[PDB]
């Protein structure tokens, strides 16, 4: 599955 390299940290 394609996962974003950056997101808002949890």
């Amino acid at each position: 599955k394609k996962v974003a390299v950056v997101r808002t940290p949890p």
Partner: antibody
Amino acid sequence: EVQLLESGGGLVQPGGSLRLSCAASGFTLSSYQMMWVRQAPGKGLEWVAGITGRGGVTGYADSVKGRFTISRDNSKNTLYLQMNSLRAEDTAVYYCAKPALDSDQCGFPEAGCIDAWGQGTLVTVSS
Amino acid sequence: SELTQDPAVSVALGQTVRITCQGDDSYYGWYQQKPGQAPVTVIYGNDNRPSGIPDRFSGSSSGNTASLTITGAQAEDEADYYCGAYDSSGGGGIFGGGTKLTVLG
């Protein structure tokens, strides 16, 4: 259909500010990480800034960091780029760019995941 | 990082052209741009062709090299092709200097 439409472009003095706007239709902006790409006359594409789905993380190219501010209004389906203390080297057609996959799959700097491009808005930084 | 592509390439009308891009560990996009126009996505995510793009456009990504193949080159394919990808060192988006395609014959 997916449509991205930018405004805010024009002639500005060196040291001046310009606010770019990108209005998204045919999809929900909040489901996507977004980015700004620019192109100097007769030159190549260059990534400027990127933002996450809720705007928790932003990213900028080395040359615009500290002067430019990428922001978004999910409620208005609009992406913004505040460009302060502009220089002649910032003269370019500025495009709004949309990743093909949602915020969980494609991040704002993944410039290989773009499926939709804006019409572009010309920024002229001249005295 | 940065993305490397040849500034120019030529193909005879009706033949096959392969445009390469050089980078490391990436998810590649291919964007067609005509002189007065905005870019158009011909391929994204190495091989994903958007609906509406003719199937004469195909994308392949081998070990540290992305490829855009245009089978049966038509007069309307004469444009600038840019490769896009991710720069993990810097944390930003990267583009190749572009490849202007000339459809001869």
